Amino acid sequence: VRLNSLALFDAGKWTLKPGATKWLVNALVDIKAKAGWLIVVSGHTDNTGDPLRNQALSLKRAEAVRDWMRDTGDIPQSCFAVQGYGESRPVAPNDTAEGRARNRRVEISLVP
């Protein structure tokens, strides 16, 4: 089960954007429906900056979404597996714009 993308990050940030909670809650409801599944949290970035820093930054966005569901959703940290894609695999053109915001995201997939 692949959950709706979570574009919750501003440029250079791994902390959640204002307005992010409503979307994290929607994802948390979907996780509560699949109790016991492996929760794979895959982080992404836009093209701006060095690709290796973007790889590191993508892992931190994945860890932040994981710790929100761990502490603000009461789910054991052992249920998650954090992943980072860096700037590879963009969903929209990275020439700044709203597309670059679409690339600063976290994809959650549930593995039975």
Author numbering: 441 to 552
Copy out sentences from the published article reporting this entry, exactly as the authors wrote them:
The type VI secretion system is a widespread mechanism found in more than a quarter of all sequenced Gram-negative bacteria, with one or several copies in each species. This nanomachine transports protein effectors directly from the cytoplasm across the cell envelope and injects them into the target cells, both prokaryotic and eukaryotic. The baseplate-sheath structure is anchored to the cell trans-envelope via a membrane-associated complex. TagL is a polytopic inner membrane protein, and its PGBD locates at the periplasmic C terminus. TagL interacts with the TssJLM membrane complex through a direct interaction with TssL.
In this study, we solved the structure of the PGBD of the EAEC TagL protein. A sequence alignment with selected sequences corresponding to known structures (OmpA and Pal from Acinetobacter baumannii, and Pal from Yersinia pestis) showed that the TagL PGBD is restricted between residues Thr440 and Pro552. TagL PGBD crystals belonged to space group P63, a = b = 75.9 Å, c = 177.7 Å; α = β = 90°, γ = 120°, with four molecules per asymmetric unit. The structure of the TagL PGBD consists of three α-helices around a four-stranded β-sheet with connectivity β1-α1-β2-α2-β3-α3-β4, β4 being antiparallel to the other β-strands. The surface of the PGBD exhibits a deep crevice defined by three loops: Lβ1-α1, Lβ2-α2 and Lβ3-α3. Among the five residues that were previously shown to be required for TagL binding to the cell wall (Asn494, Leu497, Ser498, Arg501 and Ala502), the residues Asn494, Leu497 and Arg501 locate in this crevice. As expected, the structure is highly similar to other members of the family; most importantly, the PG binding pocket is conserved as the residues involved in DAP interaction are structurally conserved, which strongly suggests that TagL binds to PG through DAP interaction in the same way as other members of the OmpA/Pal/MotB family.
